[PDB]
Design a protein around this ligand. Structure first.
Ligand code: HEM
Ligand code: HEM
Ligand SMILES: Nc1ccc2ccc(COc3cccc(CNCCc4ccccn4)c3)cc2n1
Ligand SMILES: Nc1ccc2ccc(COc3cccc(CNCCc4ccccn4)c3)cc2n1
Ligand SMILES: [Cl-]
Ligand SMILES: [Cl-]
Lengths: 361, 361
């Protein structure tokens, strides 16, 4: 019953993958071997080639991702050999270092052992490997509200300085342990960017910063029926993620009214469009700051131009394009991108990245 | 067969409408009379009360409309008595005048005789009663590209000065005529707003203007199975419709690069976010200009605040809310509105406004 869905997903996956790799004649012998292994063992093991291409396919199929032009240059690190907390921690440290690449960010995924039969071998608690803590004590709000529950979980395990930019530790659980372990990130590994504005010297009075590399670490990678629940991956930021959402949302750092004040405009009348102007200057400052520091970043116009090339590459390859319009349009000037003016089929195609339940409340 | 769908839509409509009007006990006798009329005549005639409430319900159900808070104050003008071109033309003139209301815009719909049995009694060719012509001759682009086909149709019928802001004439066809007639709009009836900026005196060098009142005139109003294909209606503008779309879209007036130049910023690098900054200043100028001239207009923040009140009024009345997220979010700073951060059921509920085929190519 379980075995059965696995074998089907493996047929679809191996056929499609070997076809794209030009290995179509190797398909029957490989599915023979796979059908054996599933009967014998209940599961099967991807080749390095299948695992690498499967992770790239999963990015290519990620309907909500505007950055998919570059799906085929994904740097796949195969860490299915890890067995200990120390090895997990070091592989996550290595990912940060090699993905950061001194600021010239490399899109990277590190793939840990897949779930055996429902049972996770490694369970990562971080939403991103690098993220700020958040606190909420008697109406005192500090740091990143989106991190409050994970921050509270971490402080149950004996771990913050209660700045607005505390780095959460790595926190993950190994199969067999009842509690996750945590490890403080070495600060030598974490690039952060202070936010300054190209024109407005006072912008630095806000003392904003953000980290260089978004490394999403709580999504499941599914390839041919194998469930890689621990497979953190990163791209580089699109500047609106930082300037229009992380620093701007009322339920995040909520900085627009402070932005308005340091750029010298009143924040009193809706019709002054002060939120919109503050958003533009904050997003300009973010792109400027990342560029000045030599940390990779893309603006939403260039990103959508790249995504149009991805759409054209799909059609030219004879692949259906799928996409989630509500996530593809940027939160800043969306009608200034081609995305806004077309529609997308939101069908789910596998391999893909998927949400999974949090282990903390 | 035809009669049959009509009777069903009438049952659903009359029950729901009389219930909201507190006339639930009058329902059986009215559907009796309706069942008679449909058998006798093939159709039935709304009371002024049903027609007024049905048009209000249709606005309330308009999934894409952020302005629905005010659905119950819609000013319904019953023009089912018109029979001649002159009466149609005068009713459309009257609509412009009374909806404009010297700039204090009144949401108004004028309802013409419904389609008999598929056959339109009046067929309005305008997309809006007030709109600018568009021209496209040997790569010379003038006026509003969205009006090119209707403008070309109008010039087949003997009607432009080829400014960028020529008013199209009213153009409509009466049952029985093979060709529509057209009538030049009296300029005394058309308020236009020159676009100036509150801070940047050079903005007036762009010589932009827009008209005061958007009067959508090509949608079908359906109420209880009766198809009012000619029922032009208006609200007031939300400023982004003008500043983020009509004047900004590359396939409309395409003014952002000229905006950038008069506000003194370079239009060279995506990462300067010059399109976003130009959009904000253009949208500020639009709101400022309408306000200075005393013409009603709403900014997208106030509008979304109003729409949140509509959502709360729906829940408090025990009505399901429907909505189209992709049209409800504004094209400027959408994540700064509550709409962006929630989802909406896009189910179609009647009475409603619907697209219908254009009569011109
Ligand atoms: C190379 C640079 C990249 C850029 C600029 C980029 C851009 C983005 C953006 C802006 C989002 C929307 C998130 C939001 O609205 O907050 C997104 C979603 C996503 N991206 Fe990419 N991305 C990139 C690389 C990657 C990589 C390397 C992968 C995986 C291998 C990936 C997989 C996804 C997935 C799964 C989502 C959806 C997540 C969800 O549903 O919550 N992206 N991307
Ligand atoms: C009172 C002021 C009003 C405001 C500010 C407002 C705002 C808007 C906006 C911004 C749109 C989206 C159009 C676009 O994205 O270009 C829209 C769509 C719509 N509005 Fe409203 N509206 C108002 C009044 C009305 C009235 C009076 C009716 C009818 C009685 C109406 C029916 C609709 C319909 C049917 C649509 C969708 C049209 C389509 O699908 O193309 N609205 N509204
Ligand atoms: N550069 C990059 C590169 C890769 C990325 C991979 C994943 C993500 C995930 O990102 C989010 C996850 C959860 C919530 C949010 C908040 N945004 C929501 C967007 C939205 C659109 C429409 C309606 C509601 N919400 C983001 C980011 C990546 N970023
Ligand atoms: N103040 C008001 C008041 C009432 C209005 C009634 C109707 C309309 C119709 O408006 C449009 C009709 C056709 C095209 C467009 C262009 N915008 C498209 C919006 C969009 C969203 C997402 C994806 C693609 N397109 C508008 C306007 C009214 N306006
Ligand atoms: Cl983020
Ligand atoms: Cl318009």
């Amino acid at each position: 019953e379980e075995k059965e869905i696995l074998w089907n997903e493996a047929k679809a996956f191996i056929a499609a993958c070997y076809q794209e790799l030009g290995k179509a004649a190797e398909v029957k012998d490989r599915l023979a071997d796979i059908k054996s292994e599933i009967d014998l063992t209940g599961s099967y093991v991807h080749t390095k080639e299948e695992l690498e291409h499967g992770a790239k396919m999963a990015w290519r199929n990620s309907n909500r991702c505007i950055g998919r032009l570059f799906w085929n240059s994904l740097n796949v690190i195969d860490r299915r050999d890890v067995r200990t907390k120390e090895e997990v921690r070091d592989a996550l440290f290595h990912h940060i270092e090699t993905a950061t690449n001194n600021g010239k960010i490399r899109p990277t995924i590190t793939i840990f052992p897949p779930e055996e039969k429902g049972e996770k071998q490694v369970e990562i608690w971080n939403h991103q490997l690098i993220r700020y803590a958040g606190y909420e004590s008697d109406g005192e709000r500090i740091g990143d509200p989106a991190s409050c529950s994970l921050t509270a979980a971490c402080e149950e395990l004996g771990w913050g300085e209660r700045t607005d930019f505390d780095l959460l530790p790595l926190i993950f659980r190994m199969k067999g342990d009842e509690q996750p372990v945590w490890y403080e990130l070495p600060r030598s590994l974490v690039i952060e960017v202070p936010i300054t504005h190209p024109d407005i010297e006072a912008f630095s009075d806000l003392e904003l910063k953000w980290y260089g590399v978004p490394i999403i670490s709580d999504m499941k990678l599914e390839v041919g029926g194998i469930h890689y629940n621990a497979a953190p991956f990163n791209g580089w930021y699109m500047g609106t993620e930082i300037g229009a959402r992380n620093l701007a949302d009322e339920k995040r750092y909520d900085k627009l009214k402070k932005v308005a004040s340091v750029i010298g405009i009143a924040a009193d009348y809706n019709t002054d469009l002060w939120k919109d102007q503050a958003l533009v200057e904050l997003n300009k400052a973010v792109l400027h700051s990342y560029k000045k520091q030599g940390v990779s970043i893309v603006d939403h116009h260039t990103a959508a131009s790249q995504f149009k090339r991805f759409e054209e590459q799909a059609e030219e390859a004879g692949r259906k394009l799928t996409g989630d319009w509500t996530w593809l349009i940027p939160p800043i000037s969306p009608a200034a991108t081609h995305i806004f003016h077309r529609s997308y089929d939101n069908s789910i195609v596998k391999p893909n990245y998927f949400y999974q339940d949090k282990p903390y409340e």
